[PDB]
Structures are given as structure tokens and as C-alpha cells.
Design a protein around this ligand. Structure first.
Ligand SMILES: CCCCCCCCCCCCCCCCCC(=O)OC[C@H](COP(=O)([O-])OCC(O)COP(=O)([O-])OC[C@@H](COC(=O)CCCCCCCCCCCCCCCCC)OC(=O)CCCCCCCCCCCCCCCCC)OC(=O)CCCCCCCCCCCCCCCCC
Ligand SMILES: CCCCCCCCCCCCCCCCCC(=O)OC[C@H](COP(=O)([O-])OCC(O)COP(=O)([O-])OC[C@@H](COC(=O)CCCCCCCCCCCCCCCCC)OC(=O)CCCCCCCCCCCCCCCCC)OC(=O)CCCCCCCCCCCCCCCCC
Ligand SMILES: CCCCCCCCCCCCCCCCCC(=O)OC[C@H](COP(=O)([O-])OCC(O)COP(=O)([O-])OC[C@@H](COC(=O)CCCCCCCCCCCCCCCCC)OC(=O)CCCCCCCCCCCCCCCCC)OC(=O)CCCCCCCCCCCCCCCCC
Ligand SMILES: CCCCCCCCCCCCCCCCCC(=O)OC[C@H](COP(=O)([O-])OCC(O)COP(=O)([O-])OC[C@@H](COC(=O)CCCCCCCCCCCCCCCCC)OC(=O)CCCCCCCCCCCCCCCCC)OC(=O)CCCCCCCCCCCCCCCCC
Ligand SMILES: CCCCCCCCCCCCCCCCCC(=O)OC[C@H](COP(=O)([O-])OCC(O)COP(=O)([O-])OC[C@@H](COC(=O)CCCCCCCCCCCCCCCCC)OC(=O)CCCCCCCCCCCCCCCCC)OC(=O)CCCCCCCCCCCCCCCCC
Ligand SMILES: CCCCCCCCCCCCCCCC(=O)OC[C@H](COP(=O)(O)O)OC(=O)CCCCCCCCCCCCCCC
Ligand SMILES: CCCCCCCCCCCCO[C@@H]1O[C@H](CO)[C@@H](O[C@H]2O[C@H](CO)[C@@H](O)[C@H](O)[C@H]2O)[C@H](O)[C@H]1O
Ligand SMILES: COCCOCCOCCOc1ccc(C(C)(C)CC(C)(C)C)cc1
Ligand SMILES: COCCOCCOCCOc1ccc(C(C)(C)CC(C)(C)C)cc1
Lengths: 68, 486, 56, 114, 97, 52, 65
């Protein structure tokens, strides 16, 4: 269907590709290496529960007062 | 600034401009008076597509061997022609209006855009050298490499078609000519002359009253001998026609001229007879000249030069390569056809050949000064002002390009010239270190022109043999030896 | 390699500095210079012999 | 005219189908699964289904995704929204006068143009 | 003695994050939110349901009266219109011309 | 196809052939023998000239 | 004496290689700013005409009206 040149990526000569840099002494920084710096939220979960309760309650209070 | 600095001398410059115009008019009158009686007519010819003229130095660049003119006077002529070219922005207010003065201001800003009158120097040589060192070498040094690349990619072609377009025998010479900035080794001009193998055999057909005859070294030697003997014309024409019929018979035995079996050219056969005009077996109609006997074969005085440049021809170069060649030679290039830039290039070529002839009349290169030779090499575009070569190296360089331009081929000329304009810049300050060896020195003897050199086979290059190692070298180089020792 | 098994072991450690491997670089410059040396010594011995002959 | 060109192996076709089969084999290699926890409802005959045994491969790739496995499911509640609203609309009671005056996308309505 | 403006190692470390992207790293990571909250799934359904809803409203009740009513009754009537359009009793329950 | 990932400079080296041998060979082929003996005479007379 | 075919850099030699890299990676940087802007431009958009619309948004380009 397609020629071998198209499959292998070169007509006559295979060109050398420059390898990827590593930056020895530190972690790689790529779009896929970001969980090393940003994990899932784990520090303020209980505060999340409390604040969701208080937000629901205060919103319900003011909505009922406005409606009434 | 330079605007006010040049405006201060703008009043004092008009008188010098008009004086230079008068000198140019007188010189052109004299030169054309000589040219209109000693030079032949090079007819205008159109390219393969037959829409624009094409130009070649073999036909159009004529050299007045016997020109009673000083070399400095011819330099003045060419430099003032360039000044006439540079005076063109004075027409901008006369075509755009009173607001067409800002172009004149831009013209007056840079001194390199300006003619001779705005320069403080007096001698034409010092003036030309100042202009070059200020503006011209820098402008050329930024066009040289990209022109070399265009020439390379014109030979080898585009899009990975080298196996279809290049030749495998000119390969090592190609490498030595285009990649000598990698090795640092000098180059041999004969290896640049090997680039003509891409082309065919350049021929010269003399037109007679019967048929055209191909010119050869033997016939040319005989004609030069007869011309040197200084015989009466009744004997001269007779001997010329004897040699002509001899060469005619020779080529008829060879199988006709070379042009018969070349694609794009050809000699027609006898015309055919159509239908009832065919008289039995005689299907042809020979020309009138078939009635003339062969003993009356006389040269008409007409000549046809055929370079047979299938890959080198200036027509097939393109819109970009011609403009870049004119930039590299500091000629006008903008907003014009390749035919007009071709003519400009051929005129420059003719000027350089006439200058070579006048130098040879004035006693060669050694009679010249150091500044004069520097300016000559700058005109030939083989030196940049950031080199500071020796006198022997300058003379050898001149000899090289003089022989190369004697062959009348701009492509190989540009290939040679661009090799001397591949300069790099280092990213570090300590490197490159200060060298320990002295500067490169040469002599006129080191150039091998009097010996043939076969093309080196691919991946089998041979070392360079000095001319002195050849037999009878002290005899062959005796002219150069006497010129140098004297 | 184990009885009834084959495996590939990879280390887990941060590499603070690159690992060096001595891959000798082929170059013709040293042999160029040694050829120059030998030719110059030949010419020097030749000159010494010629001076010895011419003077002795 | 008579160039006499040798055959160029780069212009042949002897690697495209092998490469495609290599890609497909790399795909199917991730369908390898263990015996524990294996269950597949076969057809009523007892023969396997078509789409059934090629779900583990797709979900093993979903396992390796990073963002799509946490985003592309947020358009799925909308399906149940339609499932519910359609059933609400199949039997919705409406005014006869408003239906006769403003039928939705009915033909020959001069207020629409035709 | 480098004569050029040497770029720091940390600056290269940051630029590598931007230039070491791959095609799939753009395509899928930006297409998933796009396909989900785009003209296909969510935004398209919303913005194309609105047209039918407000056509039905302006045909049956009127835009001025609809604006004058309350937000609750507005939403109720919008929901009824949405049901009428989703049903498409006149097209044989088919969203085709 | 993998020419870039190799080093065949040793497989392909420049030949050590001296073109001067082919040049002197073409010179002897063009010249006759009596001129060679004359050149031996020129050398001998040059030796006696340097001697005197 | 210095080595031949060498010189100091000039303005017409163009920018350095590191500067060419800094020129190259600017589109890749603006990608991160424009794709979120594309998604926000699509998500915070409102249609311009409805069956009830008596008016349509007009944008006089040159202020001629
Ligand atoms: C249940 C629906 C999801 C079940 C399975 C999905 C799942 O749980 O994934 C975890 C998923 C993500 O994990 P996460 O980080 O813990 O999410 C934060 C919680 O939502 C943060 O909320 P929370 O779960 O920590 O507590 C909030 C609290 C709030 O309390 C209230 O005031 C609500 C009062 C209701 C009366 O509500 C409750 O805990 C129980 C009341 C019913 C809710 O959380 C949920 O989806 C469950 C809560 C979602 C509630 C709203 C959904 C709309
Ligand atoms: C607006 C209306 C204004 C009217 C103003 C009238 C009054 C103002 C000026 C009065 C005219 C004065 C006479 C004059 O100017 O003669 C100039 C010119 C030369 O006259 P000449 O001195 O007797 O030439 C003798 C030899 O050629 C001399 O040989 P040479 O070596 O010295 O230089 C020859 C060079 C001329 O050298 C120059 O003149 C330099 C020009 C630059 C400076 C300006 O080449 C030519 O001869 C040009 C011939 C044009 C045909 C060649 C093919 C052109 C292809 C164009 C590109 C491809 C087209 C698109 C392709 C796609 C479609 C398939 O004569 C012309 O043929 C003018 C034609 C201008 C229109 C060409 C447009 C081509 C593209 C058309 C596309 C299709 C649409 C049309 C259907
Ligand atoms: C503004 C500045 C004006 C100053 C003159 C411009 C620069 C000097 C110049 O162009 O030389 C004139 C040029 C000579 O070209 P050349 O240097 O001898 O190069 C020939 C090499 O062999 C060729 O060597 P190369 O291969 O390296 O160069 C190739 C180059 C050669 O091309 C060029 O020469 C371009 C030169 C630049 C021209 C600047 C145009 C700027 C326009 C803005 C008075 C005129 C009154 C008439 C006006 C209306 C035409 O490119 C082309 O071959 C393609 C050219 C055509 C491009 C446009 C095609 C449009 C196609 C549209 C679709 C058609 C579909 C319908 C199909 C129908 C079914 C068949 O001759 C002319 O075009 C006519 C001369 C007089 C008028 C010139 C200006 C207007 C016509 C252009
Ligand atoms: C038709 C063409 C037939 C013949 C073509 C030959 C030719 O024209 O040579 C020009 C020639 C190009 O240079 P070259 O002949 O290749 O020789 C360069 C040297 O080797 C020195 O080379 P270089 O490397 O040292 O460079 C010198 C440098 C410095 O060059 C200078 O000498 C000083 C700069 C003078 C600028 C003049 C242009 C002003 C443009 C208008 C600005 C607004 C004016 C005020 C408001 C209105 O060049 C520049 O920076 C720019 C020069 C090109 C400027 C554009 C000239 C337009 C020519 C009109 C035909 C093309 C459009 C079609 O221009 C000049 O250098 C001298 C000024 C020419 C004045 C001619 C007045 C007639 C203008 C007719 C206007 C047509 C407009 C139509 C479109 C609207
Ligand atoms: C858009 C991107 C920019 C546009 C630039 C295009 C330039 C056009 C041009 O110069 O034409 C001359 C150019 C030929 O001029 P040339 O004789 O080879 O000399 C080149 C210049 O002198 C070489 O320029 P230069 O080295 O002499 O530098 C001076 C020049 C350079 O300065 C500028 O032109 C613009 C200044 C602002 C940028 C400066 C950045 C640094 O400014 C000038 O003074 C003269 C320009 C007027 O014409 C073409 O090559 C044809 C290309 C345009 C036509 C293509 C098709 C157009 C569509 C056809 C529609 C109908 C088809 C049916
Ligand atoms: C809104 C921003 C997305 C927050 C994703 C958190 C993260 O660092 O990302 C981490 C998560 C998954 O983390 P895991 O490595 O634990 O599976 O998503 C990704 O891996 C890539 C997210 C790309 C989008 C970046 C914006
Ligand atoms: C099958 C029925 C007949 C139709 C046949 C043609 C179908 C074409 C559609 C499939 C196109 C796939 O297109 C595919 O693109 C990738 C880029 O990701 C190319 O990839 C190529 O370039 C990249 C880098 O650019 C190289 O690293 C790689 O080695 C090389 O394969 C493939 O060579 C090409 O095959
Ligand atoms: C980029 O193009 C590559 C995409 O190729 C997709 C091919 O899709 C078919 C894969 O689906 C299957 C089908 C069968 C099977 C297994 C069920 C081969 C049969 C098995 C495991 C029982 C042997 C696994 C996956
Ligand atoms: C049958 O095939 C169906 C799969 O098609 C999915 C379409 O995906 C769009 C493009 O996806 C990519 C992304 C990256 C690539 C690679 C990794 C090869 C890009 C490259 C060449 C830059 C490394 C190839 C395809």
C-alpha cells in the first residue's frame, strides 16, 4: 500500500536523531512528570467536609430568607 | 553625522562629477571609435525558450589587443561607469516630487552608496581601496557562501536527485573545490576546470560558401602561422582555403561535425521532395551551393560559437543565482531580468579581460604596486581585506583567476572565487589560539597551468605534484624565473 | 535466571553524574604529524650527509 | 530517453503490512489476562461473543491513560438525562389549543414560511 | 571564555518542558475536555436545545410574557418545551428535516 | 542505509601512489634513448663543471 | 599570527544558536496560553440569534454608522 521508504521514514539514509537530554541531579520535567510536584489533594479534606456543610447551610439560609 | 559630513562637500562634488562625466564621454568616444572598426559583430541571441536574450563572454566580451590606454585610465573608466550607476537616486525628486528628497537623504547617509566625488582621497587606487574596505568587502562577504551553496545545489540538483544528476568522475574535484574550507589545503585551478565535464564540447563552426566546418587546434595553428608569416592576401586566402578544404575532408572522414549528433542542435539533410515532386528515386533536393565546386571553398567570414553548456549555461541558472552572482561581484541586480544581469556580468568579465591584457602589456603583475594589486584582486573577488596576504600569494592568486577567466566560463569562475569567502566565527575568546607558523606564502611558480591533470577517480585522490618536479621545469618556467629574479 | 523462570533486573537509583565509557576516537592527525616528523628527520639526515660530503 | 535506472529497494512495499501487524500485535499483547477473576458471559449456544473478549484490552489501555480516563466519562450522565426526559416527554399532557396554534416543526405552517 | 549569552541550566530545564511535548500529548490531553464540553456532547446539546426551547416559547407564550414571568415558571415552561422538542411528535419522533 | 552509524575511513584510504612515476614514465616513453645518454653526458659535464 | 578563515562575529552573521532556540520555542510556549484560551472562548460563548430575537449583534468596524 505504502512504500518501504515511507514506512522506515527515510528514502536512502537513516538520519541520526539527537537523544533526549536528562538533566542529571534532578527529576525530569515533562507534561507527564507533574504528579511528582502536584499530587491529588490530601491536606484539607476534613476542612472540605466542614466547609461544604457550612456553605450549603448558609446558602440555604439566605435563599429561604430571600424567598420568604 | 555622515549626512551633514557629505552635505558639507556636496557643493564641491558637482564640479568633480561633471569633470568625470566629460572624461568618461571622451574615453567612451575613443574606445568606441576603436571598437567599431576592429571588433566583430556579436549578434543578439535568445535562450532556449526564445523570449529573452542570452549572453556569453566568448562572443560578446572582446579584448582590444593593442589598446593605447594606461591601466589606471581603464580603472578610471570602469569606476566612473559605476559612479554613473550610483548617481541614479538623483532622479527620485524628478519623478516623485519635492517629497522625493528622503531617498536622496538615505543615499547620502552611507558613503558606500556614493560616487567618487564624496571621497576625500585623490588617487583612484586609494579611493577604490577605501570604498572596498569600508563597504564592498563586507557586502560581498555575506553573499559569497550562499552563492557557493546555490552553485553546489545547482550542480547536484534538488530533492535528493544526485544519483540522477551528478557525475561520478568529477566527484573528488568537486569536493576539493567546495570543501577546502574544511581541510585548509590550497586548491588547484585545474580541479575547478574539471567542472566543465558536466558540459559538452565547446565548438566553433566557420561558415563557408558550401558547408560549415568545425574548427580544430590544427587549423587554428595553421591560421596563426599564416597570419604570422605576413604574406600577401592572394597567398593568405589561398593557404587559408587550402587548410579549410583539408579540414573539411578531415571532418567528412570523421563523420561530419560534432553538432550533428548532439541533442538540441543539428544540421539538416537535403530537403525532401513531396508527392509528385519526387522524381522516382531522388527523394531529395540538394541546395544551390552543391553546384559550386569544392575547390572554390572560401570562408565567408562568419563564425558560430557553441558552448554546448547543458548544465552550466546562464539561461538555466535562474532568478536567484544570477542576482546573487551580481551581488557577489557588486553589480546592479534589483528589479531586472536575468538577461540584463547576464549582460552586466559579461561586461564586467570583458573589463577584467581588457585589464589583464593591459597589465600584460605594462609588464605583468610584478610591475604593479602592492595597493594596486590588492585593488585588482578585490575587483576579481578573490581576496577579502581581513586576510593580509603576501605579494607572492597575491600574484599567484591573480595568475590563477586570470587563467581561469581566460576559459570564459562564469560558473567555474564563481566556484573558484567563492572559496576565498568562507570565514567562520568562534564562540570562545581564547580559541582560536595564536598560530606558531608564519603566514602562507607562495609564488607564481607554484601554479601549474602548463601541464594537464586528469580527473581523480572517486575516493582515489592523488597528491599534488609541484611544477618544479616535472622534467624540463627550469626550461618551461624560464620566463617566470626571469620575471621574478629581475 | 532461576529454575523455571527468567527475569530482567533494573536498578532504582537517581544518577547524580553521567557514566563515562572510554570509546577511543579515530583521527588521522597524530599519524599526519608522525609522518611529518619522519619526513623531516629524513631530510635532516640527508642535509647532514650532504654537508659531510661537501666539506668533510 | 533510455536512462537505464536500476531498481531502488526503497520504492518497494515489503514492510508496511509487517509493521501494521507489529502494531496490532503490540495492541493484542496488552489483552493478555490471568485466570483469576476471569468471567465472560458466552452466547446462549455457549460460544463466545465478539466484543466481549476484547474489552480487557481497551480497559487495560484506559488504565494507562492519564486524563481521558478522568474526563471522557463526564458526558455519560447526559445519556441518562436523555433516557429520563424522553420518558417524561412520551406522555406529557399538553394544551390542545396551544398544540393546534403552535405545533413544533409541523409542515404547512405559514408562520414558518411554508 | 564563551562570547555568547550562555543560558542557565534551570532555564534549559524549564524550556525542555515546553519543547518536549509530543503530538499525542497535545491531541488527547486537549481533546478529552474539548470533546466532553464541546459542540458534540455538552455545549452542543445545551446551545441547540435552547434554540428549540425558545422557538416553542415564543410560539406558544411569547418572549415578553416569558421574560415577565418568574425564573421558576420560566424554567418549568422551558423544560416542557424541551420535552416537546425531544419528543418531536410532528417529525414522527425523529430529529431530521 | 545505516552509513551514518559506521566508520569506514579505514576501509577506504587514499592510495600511496606517486604520480611522478607515471610522469617520468610518460617522459621516457616520449623521449628517445640517445637523449637519455645525452642527459647522462649533461650530468657528467655538470659534475666536471662543479669540480673545476 | 592568527589562524586563517577565522574572524570575529558581526551583526550580519545573524543571531547565535541559543537565540535561535529561544526563537523556536516561543510558539510552543504560547501553545499553553492559547489552547486554554481556545477552550474558554468556546465554553464562555453565547449564540447570536434565536427565533425570538428582534435584533442581531452588529459590529461597526470603521465607525461609519
Ligand atoms: C455518593 C456519590 C458518589 C459515591 C461514589 C463516588 C465517590 O465517592 O468518589 C469520591 C468522590 C471524590 O473524592 P473526594 O475528594 O472525597 O470528593 C470530595 C467530597 O465530595 C467532599 O464531600 P464529603 O464526602 O467529604 O462530605 C460532604 C458532606 C456534606 O454534608 C452536607 O452538608 C450535605 C447535607 C445533605 C443533607 O456530605 C456527606 O459526607 C454525606 C451527606 C450526603 C452527601 O467524592 C464523591 O463524589 C462523594 C461526594 C460527592 C457529593 C456531591 C456529588 C454531586
Ligand atoms: C496597466 C496598463 C498600463 C499600460 C502602460 C502603457 C504605457 C506605459 C509603458 C509603455 C510600454 C513600453 C513598451 C514596454 O514596456 O515593453 C516592455 C516589454 C519589452 O519590450 P521589448 O524592449 O521590445 O523587448 C524586446 C526583448 O524582449 C528584449 O530582450 P531583453 O533581454 O532585453 O529582456 C527581455 C525581458 C524583458 O526585460 C524587461 O523588460 C525587464 C522588465 C522589468 C523592468 C520593468 O523579457 C521579456 O521580453 C518579457 C516578455 C514577456 C513574456 C515572457 C513571459 C513572462 C512570464 C511572466 C511570469 C509568469 C506569468 C504567470 C504564469 C501563470 C499563468 C500560466 O514588452 C512586453 O512584452 C511587456 C509585457 C508586460 C506584461 C507581461 C505580463 C506577463 C504576465 C501576464 C499573465 C497573464 C495575464 C495576461 C493575459
Ligand atoms: C513589483 C516590482 C516590479 C519590478 C519587476 C519585478 C522584478 C523583475 C522581474 O520580475 O523580471 C521580469 C520577468 C523576467 O523574469 P526572468 O528574470 O527573466 O526569469 C526567467 C527565468 O528563466 C526563470 O527562472 P526561475 O525558475 O528561477 O524563476 C521562476 C519564477 C519566474 O516568475 C517571475 O518571473 C516572477 C517575477 C516577479 C514579478 C513581480 C510580480 C509582482 C506582482 C505583485 C506593465 C504590465 C502591464 C500588465 C499588468 C498585468 C499583468 O517563478 C515562476 O516561474 C512563477 C511565476 C508566476 C507566479 C504567479 C502565478 C499566478 C498563477 C495564478 C493562477 C493562474 C490560474 C489560471 C490558469 C489558466 C490555465 C492555464 O518578466 C516578466 O514577468 C515580464 C516583464 C515586464 C513586467 C514585469 C512585472 C509584471 C509581470 C511580472
Ligand atoms: C522598472 C525597473 C526597470 C529598471 C530596473 C533597474 C532599477 O530600477 O534599479 C533600481 C535601483 C536598484 O539598485 P541596483 O540598480 O540593483 O544597483 C545597486 C548597486 O549596485 C548598489 O547595491 P547595494 O547592495 O549597495 O544597495 C544599495 C542600497 C541603496 O540604494 C540607493 O541607492 C539609495 C536608496 C534609494 C531609494 C530609492 C527608492 C525610493 C522608494 C520610494 C520611497 C518613498 C519616496 C517619498 C514618498 C513618496 O539599496 C537599497 O537599500 C534599496 C534600493 C532599492 C530601492 C527600491 C527602488 C525602486 C525602483 C523602482 C522599480 C522597482 C519597483 C517596481 O535602485 C537604486 O539603487 C537607485 C535608485 C533608483 C531610482 C529609480 C527611480 C525610478 C523609480 C520608478 C518607481 C517605480 C515604482 C513602481 C511601483 C510603485
Ligand atoms: C508578505 C511578506 C512580505 C511581502 C514582501 C513581498 C515583496 C514583493 C517584492 O518585492 O516584489 C519584488 C520581487 C522581485 O524583485 P527582485 O527584482 O528579485 O529584487 C528583490 C528585492 O530588490 C530585494 O529586496 P532588497 O534587498 O533590495 O531590500 C530593499 C527592500 C526590502 O524592504 C521591503 O521590501 C519591506 C520593508 C519592511 C521589511 C523590512 C524587514 C527587514 O525594500 C525596497 O526598498 C524595495 C521594496 C519595494 O517580486 C517577486 O519575487 C514576486 C513575489 C510576489 C508575487 C507572488 C504572487 C503574488 C500574488 C499574485 C496574485 C495574482 C496571481 C494571479
Ligand atoms: C486543572 C489542572 C489539572 C490537575 C491535574 C493534577 C496533575 O498534576 O496531573 C496528575 C494527573 C494524574 O496523576 P497520577 O500520576 O497520580 O496518575 O494527571 C496527569 O497525569 C496529567 C495532567 C495533564 C493536565 C495538566 C494541566
Ligand atoms: C490501508 C488502505 C490504503 C490506504 C493506505 C494509506 C493510509 C495512510 C493513512 C495512515 C497514515 C499514517 O501516517 C504515518 O504518519 C507517521 C507520523 O506519525 C509517519 O511516521 C514517520 O515519521 C516519523 C517522524 O515524522 C518517524 O519517526 C517514523 O519512523 C516514520 O514512520 C509514518 O511513516 C506514516 O505512515
Ligand atoms: C492503530 O491501529 C491498531 C488498532 O488495532 C485494533 C485491532 O482491533 C482488534 C482488537 O480486538 C481484539 C480482538 C480479539 C482479541 C483476543 C480476544 C485476540 C482473542 C483471544 C485473547 C481469546 C485469543 C483481542 C482483542
Ligand atoms: C487505526 O488507527 C486509529 C488510531 O488513530 C488515532 C488518531 O490519532 C491522531 C494522531 O495520533 C498520533 C500521535 C502521535 C504519533 C507519533 C507518536 C508517531 C508522533 C511522532 C511522529 C511525532 C513521534 C502518531 C499518531
Amino acid at each position: 500500500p505504502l512504500p518501504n521508504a515511507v514506512v522506515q521514514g527515510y528514502t536512502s539514509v537513516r538520519g541520526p536523531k539527537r537523544p533526549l537530554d536528562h538533566f542529571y541531579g534532578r527529576t525530569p520535567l515533562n507534561i507527564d512528570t507533574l504528579w511528582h510536584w502536584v499530587k491529588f489533594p490530601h491536606r484539607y479534606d476534613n476542612l472540605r467536609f466542614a466547609v461544604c456543610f457550612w456553605a450549603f447551610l448558609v446558602s440555604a439560609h439566605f435563599a429561604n430568607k430571600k424567598q420568604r | 553625522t555622515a549626512v551633514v559630513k557629505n552635505l558639507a562637500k556636496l557643493p564641491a562634488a558637482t564640479s568633480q562629477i561633471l569633470t568625470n562625466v566629460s572624461k568618461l564621454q571622451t574615453f567612451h568616444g575613443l574606445l568606441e571609435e576603436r571598437r567599431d572598426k576592429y571588433a566583430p559583430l556579436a549578434y543578439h541571441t535568445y535562450d532556449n525558450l526564445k523570449q529573452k536574450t542570452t549572453w556569453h563572454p566568448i562572443a560578446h566580451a572582446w579584448v582590444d589587443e593593442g589598446l593605447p590606454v594606461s591601466k589606471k585610465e581603464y580603472n578610471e573608466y570602469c569606476w566612473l561607469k559605476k559612479d554613473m550607476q550610483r548617481l541614479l537616486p538623483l532622479a527620485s525628486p524628478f519623478v516623485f516630487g519635492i517629497y522625493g528628497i528622503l531617498p536622496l537623504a538615505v543615499w547620502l547617509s552611507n558613503d558606500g552608496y556614493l560616487p567618487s566625488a564624496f571621497s576625500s582621497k585623490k588617487d583612484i587606487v586609494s579611493k577604490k581601496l577605501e570604498w572596498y574596505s569600508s563597504y564592498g568587502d563586507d557586502l560581498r562577504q555575506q553573499v559569497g557562501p550562499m552563492l557557493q551553496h546555490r552553485l553546489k545545489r545547482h550542480l547536484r540538483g534538488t530533492l535528493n536527485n544526485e544519483h540522477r544528476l551528478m557525475l561520478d568522475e568529477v566527484t573528488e574535484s568537486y569536493k576539493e573545490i567546495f570543501y577546502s574550507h574544511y581541510t585548509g589545503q590550497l586548491r588547484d585551478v585545474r580541479k575547478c576546470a574539471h567542472l566543465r565535464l558536466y558540459d559538452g564540447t565547446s565548438t566553433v563552426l566557420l561558415l563557408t560558401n558550401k558547408e560549415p566546418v568545425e574548427l580544430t587546434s590544427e587549423l587554428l595553428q595553421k591560421w596563426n602561422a599564416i597570419k604570422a608569416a605576413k604574406l600577401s592576401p592572394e597567398e593568405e586566402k589561398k593557404a587559408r582555403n587550402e587548410a579549410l578544404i583539408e579540414a573539411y575532408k578531415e571532418q567528412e572522414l570523421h563523420g561530419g561535425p560534432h553538432v550533428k549528433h548532439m541533442q538540441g542542435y543539428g544540421i539538416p539533410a537535403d530537403t525532401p521532395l513531396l508527392g509528385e515532386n519526387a522524381k522516382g528515386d531522388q527523394y531529395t533536393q540538394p541546395p544551390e551551393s552543391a553546384s559550386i565546386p569544392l575547390e572554390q571553398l572560401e570562408w565567408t567570414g562568419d563564425t558560430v560559437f557553441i558552448p554546448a553548456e547543458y548544465r552550466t549555461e546562464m539561461e538555466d541558472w535562474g532568478r536567484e543565482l544570477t542576482k546573487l552572482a551580481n551581488q557577489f561581484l557588486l553589480l546592479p541586480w534589483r528589479f531586472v531580468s536575468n538577461a540584463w544581469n547576464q549582460r552586466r556580468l559579461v561586461s564586467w568579465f570583458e573589463e577584467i579581460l581588457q585589464e589583464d591584457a593591459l597589465i600584460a602589456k605594462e609588464g605583468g603583475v610584478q610591475a604593479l604596486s602592492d595597493d594596486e594589486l590588492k585593488v585588482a584582486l578585490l575587483d576579481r573577488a578573490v581576496i577579502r581585506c581581513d586576510e593580509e596576504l603576501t605579494r607572492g600569494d597575491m600574484e599567484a592568486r591573480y595568475k590563477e583567476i586570470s587563467w581561469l577567466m581566460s576559459l570564459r566560463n562564469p560558473f567555474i569562475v564563481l566556484a573558484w572565487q567563492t572559496g576565498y569567502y568562507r570565514s567562520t566565527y568562534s564562540p570562545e575568546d581564547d580559541l582560536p589560539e595564536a598560530s606558531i607558523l608564519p603566514k602562507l606564502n607562495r609564488t607564481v611558480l607554484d601554479v601549474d597551468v602548463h601541464n594537464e591533470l586528469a580527473p581523480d577517480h572517486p575516493e582515489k585522490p592523488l597528491p599534488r605534484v609541484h611544477p618544479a618536479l616535472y622534467p624540463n621545469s627550469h626550461l618551461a618556467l624560464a620566463k617566470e624565473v626571469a620575471v621574478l629574479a629581475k | 535466571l532461576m529454575n523455571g523462570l527468567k527475569m530482567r533486573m533494573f536498578s532504582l537509583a537517581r544518577q547524580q553524574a553521567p557514566k563515562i565509557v572510554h570509546k577511543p576516537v579515530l583521527s588521522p592527525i597524530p599519524e599526519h604529524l608522525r609522518l611529518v616528523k619522519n619526513v623531516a628527520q629524513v631530510q635532516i639526515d640527508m642535509l647532514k650527509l650532504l654537508n659531510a660530503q661537501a666539506a668533510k | 530517453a533510455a536512462p537505464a535506472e536500476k531498481p531502488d529497494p526503497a520504492l518497494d512495499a515489503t514492510k508496511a503490512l509487517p509493521k501494521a501487524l507489529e502494531e496490532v500485535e503490540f495492541f493484542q499483547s496488552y489483552a493478555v489476562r490471568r485466570k483469576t477473576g476471569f468471567h465472560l458471559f458466552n452466547r446462549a449456544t455457549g460460544s463466545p461473543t465478539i466484543v466481549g473478549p476484547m474489552f480487557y484490552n481497551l480497559y487495560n489501555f484506559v488504565r494507562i491513560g492519564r486524563v481521558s480516563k478522568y474526563v471522557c466519562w463526564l458526558s455519560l450522565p447526559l445519556v441518562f438525562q436523555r433516557m429520563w426526559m424522553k420518558n417524561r416527554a412520551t406522555g406529557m399532557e399538553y394544551d390542545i389549543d396551544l398544540e393546534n396554534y403552535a405545533p413544533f416543526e409541523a409542515k404547512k405552517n405559514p408562520m414558518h414560511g411554508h | 571564555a564563551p562570547l555568547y549569552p550562555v543560558l542557565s541550566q534551570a532555564s534549559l530545564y524549564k524550556r525542555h518542558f515546553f519543547k518536549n511535548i509530543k503530538l499525542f500529548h497535545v491531541v488527547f490531553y486537549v481533546g478529552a475536555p474539548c470533546v466532553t464540553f464541546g459542540t458534540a456532547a455538552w455545549s452542543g446539546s445545551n446551545r441547540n436545545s435552547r434554540e428549540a426551547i425558545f422557538m416553542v416559547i415564543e410560539e406558544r407564550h411569547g418572549w415578553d410574557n416569558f421574560k415577565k414571568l418568574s425564573s421558576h415558571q420560566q424554567g418549568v415552561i422551558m423544560q416542557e418545551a424541551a420535552q416537546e422538542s425531544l419528543l418531536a411528535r410532528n417529525k414522527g419522533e425523529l430529529h431530521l428535516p | 542505509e545505516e552509513c551514518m552509524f559506521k566508520d569506514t575511513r579505514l576501509d577506504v584510504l587514499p592510495p600511496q601512489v606517486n604520480p611522478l612515476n607515471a610522469i617520468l614514465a610518460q617522459h621516457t616513453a616520449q623521449t628517445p634513448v640517445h637523449r637519455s645518454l645525452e642527459k647522462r653526458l649533461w650530468t657528467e659535464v655538470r659534475a666536471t663543471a662543479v669540480s673545476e | 599570527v592568527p589562524v586563517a578563515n577565522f574572524r570575529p562575529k558581526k551583526p550580519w552573521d545573524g543571531p547565535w544558536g541559543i537565540q535561535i532556540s529561544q526563537k523556536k520555542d516561543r510558539p510552543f510556549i504560547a501553545m499553553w496560553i492559547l489552547f486554554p484560551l481556545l477552550l474558554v472562548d468556546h465554553l464562555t460563548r453565547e449564540y447570536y440569534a434565536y427565533w425570538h430575537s428582534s435584533k442581531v449583534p452588529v459590529t461597526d468596524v470603521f465607525g461609519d454608522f
